[PDB]
Design a protein around this nucleic acid. Structure first.
Ligand SMILES: Nc1ccn([C@@H]2O[C@H](COP(=O)(O)CP(=O)(O)OP(=O)(O)O)[C@@H](O)[C@H]2O)c(=O)n1
Ligand SMILES: [Mg+2]
Lengths: 248, 69, 49, 231, 315, 97, 230
RNA sequence: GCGGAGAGGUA
C-alpha cells in the first residue's frame, strides 16, 4: 500500500503466511522451494546443532480456492536474524501486508460509464497483468468396493473415442501440466457389470474382439462443465491390499 | 425495434385484448396459413402484427369476417 | 500532506489539470488524481454468471 | 495558397525517450494532429513480443526449478517485458542457455542476426547452485495490439505439448505519449504553432518510423473518406 | 411441515417455481442503450435461446437434424452467431432484480448482444429497479409463446412503464450523473468567455462551445423558435430573442416541439428536470417522452464528463 | 422403439429402449451398435454396420413387421370443408403373393 | 500490419441540409479518433465567405432604433449572420441593400452582383412597416476559415474607427451543426469494432457529403508530408 | 449423487 497504517508488518508476520527465521544466521542456499541458512555461532546449539532449513509451499489450494504461494525475499549470503521475513506468503511483500494493489485513480464522471458505484478501468491494467489471480479447484474420483465387484481406474473405458484417452497416460490419469476444458475426462474409472448372461456366439465374439463383459459402463470423472485450466498436481491414496498405480 | 405500442392501444382502449388480437394475428402469420399485409423490414412476426395493428388494417372484427369468409 | 506533495514538486492542492484522452480538449475545473490502494474482491462475474 | 506541416528535428534524449517536432502547423490543427497521433500510436503500433516459451525441466507455468528463486510464472512475467526488435521474419526462436551461479539476464540470449535485444541488462532469473543449469527457447512474434492467452485458447490448434507455456502478447512498444502545441514564431507570420510529441517506448520502435506509420494509417482512413458512393 | 410453511410447499413450489430459459449475472451501466433495450452477453443469450437457434437453423437448412444443430451450437461457429442475431431481433427478454418490490421490478427489454459476462442495464430504469452498480445482480427470463412475447413487449416493456403505478409521477427521472451534467450545463456565471454575444440559434451555440470560442455556461442573447400546440393539435412557431446561457441553448436542441422554452431556462436541478419530464409527458404523450428521456440521459452524461467535476480536500 | 442417437459424423448409434416392440432383437444388444449409411464412412469406420436395403437389420425388421399384424388396422378422422359430412373413404391394401 | 478499412457508407439525407452518415466497419478505438478529427476540422477550420462588418446610413451604435422597423437592430444583425454567400473570383466584396414598401425584406432583395451567389434567396433580413419603409445598408463579406466572434476583434480595436462601424460575427464554415456518435459493431466474430454516425447540418450552400469531402481532403493535404508507406 | 442441516458471504 502506498498509504498504509504501519500495522501491515504486524499482520503479515503474525499470520502464518510468511516464512520467518527461528535461529538467526546467514542464507546458505536459496531456491524457489526452500531457504537453507547456516546458524550464527551465538545461537548455534553446542551439541548437535546443524543448520536450519525452511521448505516453502508453492501453489496449493486455500479454503476459498485461491492460491497460496511463497516467494523468497533474501539472496545468497545475506545475514538473517531471528524474526526476519525470509519468504513472502500470499499477498504480502517483504514482510508487509499487500492485500490488493495501488493504482492511479481520477475522480470524475466519464460519460456515465462510472454512473453508479461502478468503476472504469484502463486497458493498461489488464496489459500490465496486475489484477489476474490464480485459483485452484480440487476434484476427487473415488473408487470404492461394490459387491458386484470393485470399480477400476484403468484407462480402458467402454465406448469412449481415443481422443478422450489421448491426454491420459497408461495408468488412466491426466498428465501434469495438461490443459483441459469442460467435458474433458478428468480421470478414468470403469463401472462393473454383472449377470451379463451373454449368448454363446456372443461370448466367442467377445474373446476374439476383446470386448469386456465386466465393463460396458463408465464412471470416469470429467472436468465440470464450463471450467477450464491446467492440471498442476495429482495425488493418489490407496488403502491396504491395493496395488500402487504408475502415478503413485 | 418497435419501441412503443401507444397507437395500437389508442385503437383499442382496453390495452389487454389488444394483446389477444395481436397474438391471434401473429399466430396465423407464424404457422404459415396467412401472409403479412405490410412490407416486413426483417422484423419477427410479433412486431409485424403490432405494426399491422397500428396501421388500422387488422382488428378483431376483420379477423372474424376473414375467418368466416 | 501538502508538505509531502510540495517535496515531490506536485500541485499542493492535490488536483491536476487533465486532458480528455478521446477528444484532447481540456476538462474545466481540474480533477483529483492520485494513487489509491484498491482491491479485487472474490466476487468474480464469471463465477456469478 | 496554404501551408502544410513538415517533420522537423527529432531529438533523442535516451534510447527509450524521444521528442519529435513539427514546425509549420496552422492554427487549430495543433491539437487535432497531436491527438490523432497520440491515439494511433497508443493503439496501433506494430511490435514484436514473446508469445510462448518452452523451458526444459518444467511441465507448467506453476512448477518450480531447482536452483532458482523466482517461480516459473515469474519467469514468464519477466519475459513479457522483454523488448526485442525483429526485422525480417514473423516468428523467431531465441535460445537462452546459462549454467552456474549468477543472474541470467537478457544479454545471455543466443545472438541471432535478425533479432535485436534492446536491453541486455534486463534480468530473467538468478541461479543459486553450481550445477544448476537453465535452458529455454522463447518464441517471438510480430503483431499489433493486445491478445491474451485465454482468447487464443479457442484456436488452440494442437497446443498438445504440455511443455508449452503460453504468454499474453502485448504487441505494442509505446508506453506513454504526450504532446504540446506551442506558439511557432515563423519569421513572416503572426500566429503559428509547432507540435511537440514526447514519447516513451520500450526501445524497439524508432520514433521516425512510429510517427510515419501512424500518419500513414490516418491518411489511409482519410483516403477511405475521399470517395463517397451515394449509389 | 412439507405443505405448511415457507420452505415447504405452496410458497416454495406452487407460487415460487423455478422457470427454464433463465439466467443471472451482474449488472453494468451501458449508457449508450435505448430506453427499451438491454445489453445481453452472447453466451447467455445463446444458452437461453438454444431451442430457437435449433428451430431457425433447421428452417434455414444449415442442419439436417436436431442433433446436428446441437453439435453446431456446441462448436459455436459464425453461422450460429448470425442466426442468434437474427432471432434475437424483436424477441424481448424479462429483466428482474432480486427484491421485486413493485411491478417495475420486472420489465421487458430488447437485448443487444455484447461481449462480457455482465448484463447491461439502462441507467434511467435503475430507479425503478432500485438497482445500483456495486455488485447487484439481475435475472433474465425469456418469454416463449407468441402471447407471452406480445405481453412482454406491450405491458412490461420499459418504455410503457414510465409512470409509477402508486402515484402518477414519473419513475424514470434522471438520477445522479445526468442531473449533475444538466445542472452544470444550465447554471450561469457572471463573467466568462463570450459574455453577451448574440447567437442566431442553439446550433451556433454548439459551434462556439465545442470549438472553445465560448464557455459552456456564459450569459448570451439567442434567437429561438419555440413551438406551441395551442390550436387543436397544430404547432405554432413563436420566434424571439431570449437571454440565456450557452448551456441552456445546447440543452434545448433535444427538447421536442411542444414544450415552452421556459422549461430549460432555469438552474435545472433534480426537481426541475423531473417536472420537465412531467410536462413533456402531459403535453406530447408517450413516444416523445421516451425519446426525450433518452436524449436527456445522453446529453447529461456527455456534459458531466466534459465538466470534469471532482472532489478535492479543499472543495 | 429403438433410440437413435445422432453422434454427428455420419454415424448413428442405435440402442434399444424401454418401449421397444419385440422380445429380443436378433442383431441388437443393450449396449447398442453404431451404423453408417455412407459406404466411405463404413470403409473408414469398420466398427459400424453398413446399412443398405439388403442389410440384415432392415430385412429382419421387415420380416418382423410384415409377419406380425401391427399396422394392419387403424381408424382416422378427416376435417375437410370441401367434402360432404359422414362420407366414407376406405384404404384397402391387398397383397399379391 | 493489415488494417480494417470501412465499407458500407450509408447516408440518410432527411431534409437536404441535414444528413446522417453511418460507417459500421472499423478498428477498435478509431471511432473517436477519426470522428473527432473530422468534427473539429469541419467545425473550426473550413474556408468560406461571410458578412464581417456593416455600416448603417442611419444609426451610429448597435442599440439605437430606426423608425418604422418593429424588429430591433440586434435582430437585423442576427439575420445578417445567417447569410450564406459564395463568391467565385473576388476575395472581399461589398453588397448593398436598399428596400422600400411593406413586407419582409429578404435576402433576394439584395442587388444582384456578378461573382456572388446567395444560396438561400428566401432568408428573411428585415421587416418594413407602412408609408415610410426606408431601409438602406452596405454589408461587406470576406473569405476566411472557421468562426470568428465579434469580441476577439473588438478586443484588439485600439485603431479607433469612426462611429457606426458595426462588427458582425463571421460565419465562414458552411457547417451549422456537427456531431458524431460511436457505437458497437461486430463483424460476425470480432466485436470490438465500432460504427460512426455523423449527423451534419449545413447552411444550404454545399450539401453535407461534399462538406465532409473537402474536410477529409484538407486533412489529408496537411498529413501528406509525412505519410510515405504506400 | 436428487436432498436437508450447520457456517459464511452478496444485494
Ligand atoms: N439486509 C439487506 C441489505 C440490503 N438489501 C438490498 O440492498 C439494497 C439496499 O439499498 P440501500 O438503499 O440500503 C443503499 P443504496 O441503494 O446503494 O443507496 P446509498 O448507498 O447511496 O444509500 C436494496 O435493494 C435491498 O433490497 C437487502 O435486500 N437486505
Ligand atoms: Mg447495489
Amino acid at each position: 500500500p502506498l498509504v498504509g497504517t504501519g500495522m501491515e508488518r504486524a499482520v503479515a508476520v503474525d499470520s502464518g503466511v510468511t516464512a520467518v527465521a527461528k535461529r538467526g544466521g546467514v542464507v546458505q542456499y536459496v531456491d524457489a522451494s526452500r531457504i537453507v541458512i547456516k546458524v550464527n555461532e551465538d545461537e548455534m546449539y553446542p551439541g548437535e546443532a546443524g543448520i536450519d532449513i525452511y521448505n516453502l509451499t508453492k501453489y496449493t489450494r486455500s479454503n476459498q480456492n485461491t492460491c497460496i504461494n511463497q516467494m523468497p525475499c533474501v539472496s545468497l549470503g545475506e545475514p538473517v536474524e531471528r524474526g526476519d521475513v525470509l519468504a513472502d506468503g500470499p499477498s504480502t511483500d517483504l514482510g508487509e501486508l499487500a492485500l490488493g494493489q495501488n493504482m492511479r485513480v481520477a475522480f470524475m464522471p466519464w460519460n456515465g460509464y462510472n454512473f453508479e458505484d461502478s468503476i472504469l478501468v484502463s486497458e493498461r491494467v489488464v496489459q500490465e497483468d496486475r489484477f489476474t489471480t490464480i485459483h485452484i479447484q480440487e476434484l476427487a474420483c473415488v473408487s470404492r468396493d461394490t459387491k458386484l465387484g470393485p470399480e477400476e481406474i484403468t484407462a480402458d473405458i467402454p465406448n469412449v473415442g481415443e481422443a478422450a484417452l489421448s491426454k491420459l497416460d497408461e495408468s488412466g490419469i491426466v498428465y501434469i501440466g495438461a490443459e483441459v476444458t469442460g467435458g474433458d475426462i478428468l480421470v478414468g474409472k470403469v463401472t462393473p457389470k454383472g449377470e451379463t448372461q451373454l449368448t454363446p456366439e456372443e461370448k466367442l465374439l467377445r474373446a476374439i474382439f476383446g470386448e469386456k463383459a465386466s465393463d460396458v459402463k463408465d464412471s470416469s470423472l470429467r472436468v465440470p462443465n464450463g471450467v477450464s485450466g491446467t492440471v498442476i498436481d495429482v495425488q493418489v491414496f490407496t488403502r491396504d491390499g491395493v496395488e500402487k498405480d504408475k502415478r503413485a | 425495434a418497435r419501441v412503443t405500442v401507444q397507437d395500437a392501444v389508442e385503437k383499442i382502449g382496453n390495452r389487454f385484448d389488444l394483446v389477444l388480437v395481436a397474438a391471434r394475428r401473429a399466430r396465423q402469420m407464424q404457422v404459415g396459413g396467412k401472409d403479412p399485409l405490410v412490407p416486413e423490414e426483417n422484423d419477427k412476426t410479433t412486431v409485424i402484427a403490432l405494426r399491422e395493428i397500428e396501421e388500422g388494417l387488422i382488428n378483431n372484427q376483420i379477423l372474424d369476417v376473414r375467418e368466416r369468409q | 500532506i501538502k508538505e509531502l506533495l510540495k517535496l515531490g514538486d506536485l500541485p499542493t492542492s492535490g488536483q491536476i489539470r487533465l486532458y480528455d484522452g478521446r477528444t484532447g480538449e481540456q476538462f474545466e475545473r481540474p480533477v483529483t488524481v492520485g494513487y489509491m490502494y484498491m482491491l479485487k474482491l472474490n466476487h468474480l462475474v464469471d463465477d456469478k454468471m | 495558397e496554404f501551408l502544410k506541416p513538415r517533420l522537423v528535428d527529432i531529438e533523442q534524449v535516451s534510447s527509450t525517450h524521444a521528442k519529435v517536432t513539427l514546425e509549420p502547423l496552422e492554427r487549430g490543427f495543433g491539437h487535432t494532429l497531436g491527438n490523432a497521433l497520440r491515439r494511433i500510436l497508443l493503439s496501433s503500433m506494430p511490435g514484436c513480443a514473446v508469445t510462448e516459451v518452452e523451458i526444459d525441466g518444467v511441465l507448467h507455468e506453476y512448477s518450480t526449478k531447482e536452483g532458482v528463486q523466482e517461480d516459473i510464472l515469474e519467469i514468464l512475467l519477466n519475459l513479457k517485458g522483454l523488448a526485442v526488435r525483429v526485422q525480417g521474419k514473423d516468428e523467431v526462436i531465441l535460445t537462452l542457455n546459462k549454467s552456474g551461479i549468477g543472474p541470467v539476464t537478457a544479454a545471455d540470449i543466443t545472438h541471432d542476426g535478425d533479432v535485436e535485444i534492446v536491453k541486455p541488462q534486463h534480468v530473467i532469473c538468478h541461479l543459486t547452485d553450481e550445477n544448476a543449469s537453465i535452458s529455454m527457447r522463447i518464441k517471438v512474434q510480430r503483431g499489433r495490439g493486445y491478445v491474451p492467452a485465454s482468447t487464443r485458447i479457442h484456436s488452440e490448434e494442437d497446443e498438445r505439448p504440455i511443455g508449452r507455456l503460453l504468454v499474453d502478447a502485448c504487441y505494442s512498444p509505446v508506453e506513454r505519449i504526450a504532446y504540446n502545441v506551442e506558439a511557432a514564431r515563423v519569421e513572416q507570420r503572426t500566429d503559428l504553432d509547432k507540435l511537440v510529441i514526447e514519447m516513451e517506448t520500450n526501445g524497439t520502435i524508432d520514433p521516425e518510423e512510429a510517427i510515419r506509420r501512424a500518419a500513414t494509417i490516418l491518411a489511409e482512413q482519410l483516403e477511405a473518406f475521399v470517395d463517397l458512393r451515394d449509389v | 411441515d412439507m405443505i405448511k410453511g415457507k420452505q415447504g410447499r405452496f410458497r416454495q413450489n406452487l407460487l415460487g417455481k423455478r422457470v427454464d430459459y433463465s439466467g443471472r449475472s451482474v449488472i453494468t451501466v451501458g449508457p449508450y442503450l435505448r430506453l427499451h433495450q438491454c445489453g445481453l452477453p452472447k453466451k447467455m443469450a445463446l444458452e437461453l435461446f438454444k431451442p430457437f437457434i435449433y428451430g431457425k437453423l433447421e428452417l434455414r437448412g444449415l442442419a439436417t437434424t436436431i442433433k446436428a444443430a446441437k453439435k453446431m451450437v456446441e462448436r459455436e461457429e459464425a453461422v450460429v452467431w448470425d442466426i442468434l442475431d437474427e432471432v434475437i431481433r424483436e424477441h424481448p427478454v424479462l429483466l428482474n432484480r432480486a427484491p421485486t418490490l413493485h411491478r417495475l421490478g420486472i420489465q421487458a427489454f430488447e437485448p443487444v448482444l455484447i461481449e462480457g459476462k455482465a448484463i447491461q442495464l439502462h441507467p434511467l430504469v435503475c430507479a425503478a429497479y432500485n438497482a445500483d452498480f456495486d455488485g447487484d445482480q439481475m435475472a433474465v427470463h425469456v418469454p416463449l409463446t407468441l402471447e407471452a412475447q406480445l405481453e412482454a413487449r406491450a405491458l412490461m416493456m420499459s418504455t410503457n412503464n414510465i409512470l409509477s403505478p402508486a402515484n402518477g409521477e414519473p419513475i424514470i427521472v434522471p438520477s445522479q450523473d445526468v442531473v449533475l451534467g444538466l445542472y452544470y450545463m444550465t447554471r450561469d456565471c457572471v463573467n466568462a468567455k463570450g459574455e453577451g454575444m448574440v447567437l442566431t440559434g442553439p446550433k451556433e451555440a454548439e459551434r462556439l462551445y465545442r470549438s472553445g470560442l465560448a464557455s459552456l455556461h456564459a450569459r448570451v442573447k439567442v434567437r429561438i423558435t419555440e413551438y406551441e400546440k395551442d390550436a387543436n393539435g397544430e404547432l405554432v412557431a413563436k420566434t424571439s430573442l431570449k437571454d440565456t446561457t450557452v448551456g441552456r441553448a445546447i440543452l434545448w436542441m433535444i427538447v421536442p416541439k411542444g414544450l415552452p422554452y421556459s422549461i430549460v431556462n432555469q438552474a435545472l436541478g433534480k426537481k426541475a428536470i423531473s417536472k420537465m419530464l412531467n410536462t413533456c409527458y402531459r403535453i406530447l404523450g408517450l413516444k416523445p417522452t421516451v425519446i426525450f428521456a433518452d436524449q436527456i440521459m445522453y446529453t447529461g452524461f456527455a456534459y458531466a464528463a466534459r465538466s470534469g467535476a471532482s472532489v478535492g480536500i479543499d472543495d | 422403439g429403438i433410440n437413435q442417437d445422432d453422434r454427428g459424423d455420419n454415424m448413428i448409434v442405435l440402442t434399444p429402449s424401454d418401449h421397444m416392440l419385440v422380445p429380443d432383437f436378433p442383431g441388437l444388444s443393450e449396449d447398442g451398435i453404431t451404423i453408417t449409411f455412407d459406404r466411405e464412412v463404413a470403409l473408414a469406420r469398420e466398427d459400424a454396420q453398413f446399412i443398405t436395403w439388403e442389410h440384415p437389420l432392415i430385412r429382419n425388421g421387415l420380416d418382423l413387421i410384415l409377419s406380425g399384424d401391427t399396422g394392419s388396422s387403424t381408424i382416422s378422422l378427416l376435417k375437410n370443408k370441401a367434402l360432404p359430412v359422414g362420407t366414407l373413404l376406405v384404404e384397402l391394401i391387398y397383397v399379391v403373393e
